Design a protein around this ligand. Structure first.
Ligand SMILES: CCn1c(=O)c(-c2ccc(Cl)cc2Cl)cc2cnc(Nc3ccc(N4CCNCC4)c(F)c3)nc21
Length: 290
């Protein structure tokens, strides 16, 4: 049953105990699939992040493979770097880069962002999504919560628990996964869907950065989901705070027809993204700076 998973892991993971070089573990967080900790590296004095998870008590064990097997070795400035993974008892530990700035979701709830800062975030996420989409990877869970910030103000994509690899021969997936408010129409349709569901989800994230919340966030998840499927492209509640430039950009992401919805490739050219400021424009927005 479970020790078949254990055995496959032992192919992948680096062997040996990461306690041979890691200590002063401290809990950051948790999102059901495991606990997450900060730990110090003895040899060098640096901090890392460590996701730990017991193999037996995982329920969508399938997904546990997807982060490790996909995320292992993708080189990208705007993606969260995995260092190693280890088998430690009946537990998988994954060691990652530690982003000091935390999630963007902390920022969008408390403050409102200007367009320079919005453009930067979008730029970073589109750079990363273009490559991931250039190698078959649909993230399938884009939202402010899965964006992390360095102290420099750099933006990196993470939280690949739900990602899926896709190819020339089977170019779509069926599986109903994601966060409701952020899921595309076709995904709730139970239709086959491609790497464009990232783009809709991104659009919903822009509405997060401008409004503070996504559409229908008052509703229950089941209500909101028919609403996104059935009804029109949702709209910015604060349309008046927003450029015609950004408004255009946004109208090319929230296309309900998937066919004519735009692409990381395409969107990387748009005039909206030339407003993007450097990493330093983002710093002030953080909790140490607020
Ligand atoms: C659970 C978050 N998390 C991960 O899950 C992972 C991760 C994801 C998938 C895998 Cl396979 C392994 C890991 Cl290791 C990496 C990670 C790296 N850096 C950070 N930085 C960080 C800094 C401060 C805060 N907060 C400030 C204010 N209030 C809430 C606490 C914060 F939420 C986050 N978080 C990561």
């Amino acid at each position: 049953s479970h020790e078949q998973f254990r055995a496959a892991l032992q192919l992948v993971v680096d062997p040996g105990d990461p306690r041979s070089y890691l200590d002063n573990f401290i809990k950051i967080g948790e999102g059901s699939t495991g606990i997450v900790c900060i730990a110090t590296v003895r040899s060098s004095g640096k901090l890392v992040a460590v996701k730990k998870m017991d193999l037996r008590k995982q329920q969508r064990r399938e997904l546990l493979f997807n982060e490790v097997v996909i995320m292992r070795d993708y080189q990208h400035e705007n993606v969260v770097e995995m260092y190693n993974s280890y088998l430690v008892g009946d537990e998988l530990w994954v060691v990652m880069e530690f982003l000091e700035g935390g999630a963007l979701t902390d920022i969008v709830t408390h403050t409102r962002m200007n367009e320079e800062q919005i453009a930067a975030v979008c730029l970073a996420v589109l750079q990363a999504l273009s490559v991931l989409h250039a190698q078959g990877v649909i993230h399938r869970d884009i939202k402010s919560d899965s964006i992390l910030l360095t102290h420099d103000g750099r933006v990196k994509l993470s939280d690949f628990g739900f990602c899926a690899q896709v190819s020339k021969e089977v170019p779509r997936r069926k599986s109903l996964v994601g966060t409701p408010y952020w899921m595309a129409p076709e995904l709730i349709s139970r239709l086959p869907y491609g790497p464009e569901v990232d783009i809709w989800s991104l659009g919903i994230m822009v509405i997060e950065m401008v409004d503070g919340e996504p559409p229908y966030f008052n509703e229950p998840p089941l209500k909101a989901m028919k609403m996104i499927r059935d009804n029109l492209p949702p709209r910015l509640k604060n349309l008046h705070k927003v450029s015609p430039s950004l408004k255009g950009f946004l109208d090319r992401l929230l296309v309900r027809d998937p066919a004519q919805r735009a692409t990381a490739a395409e969107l990387l050219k748009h005039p909206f993204l030339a407003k993007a400021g450097p990493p330093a424009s983002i710093v002030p927005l953080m909790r140490q700076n607020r």
